Design a protein around this ligand. Structure first.
Ligand SMILES: CCOC(=O)c1ccc(-c2csc3c(=O)cc(N4CCOCC4)oc23)cc1
Length: 131
């Protein structure tokens, strides 16, 4: 068709780790985002073939979505919280560079992003490890 396989969520070489900030991201930030009115387009990888998105994978070199992010959180895939935050920003900016400003999907991403920036500002200022 063809869609690339979902992004990796497990790191054999890359070391596993957990912090109170990654914990807050999973148990609070992502839980709030997941039930937003506009979460559903971002809950799984973009099926660009079924959606007939021309050149989507030529233009979007790093596909990203909240289902991948959630599983990476559940797999301690991230070293720290800022790494998780980068995947969220990649998901939002993917949508902004691919679509006309002000389109429906862009409005949905913008509203999710606005909620996301609000919740990540509740993150503990100090990072502390977890077993
Ligand atoms: C089977 C039903 O699922 C959906 O309705 C669905 C799922 C994911 C997306 C989505 C996520 S990012 C993104 C993008 O960057 C651009 C497009 N477009 C643009 C051209 O109009 C059409 C959707 O869609 C998406 C959109 C709809």
């Amino acid at each position: 068709s063809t869609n690339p396989p979902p992004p990796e969520t497990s790191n054999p070489n890359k070391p596993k780790r957990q912090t109170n900030q990654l914990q807050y991201l999973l148990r609070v930030v992502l839980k709030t985002l997941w039930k937003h009115q506009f979460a559903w387009p971002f809950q799984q990888p973009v099926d660009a073939v079924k959606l007939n998105l021309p050149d989507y994978y030529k233009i979007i070199k790093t596909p990203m979505d909240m289902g991948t992010i959630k599983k990476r959180l559940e797999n301690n895939y991230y070293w720290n919280a800022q790494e998780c935050i980068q995947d969220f920003n990649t998901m939002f900016t993917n949508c902004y560079i691919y679509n006309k400003p002000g389109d429906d999907i862009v409005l949905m991403a913008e509203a999710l992003e606005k909620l996301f920036l609000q919740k990540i500002n509740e993150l503990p200022t100090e990072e502390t490890e977890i077993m």
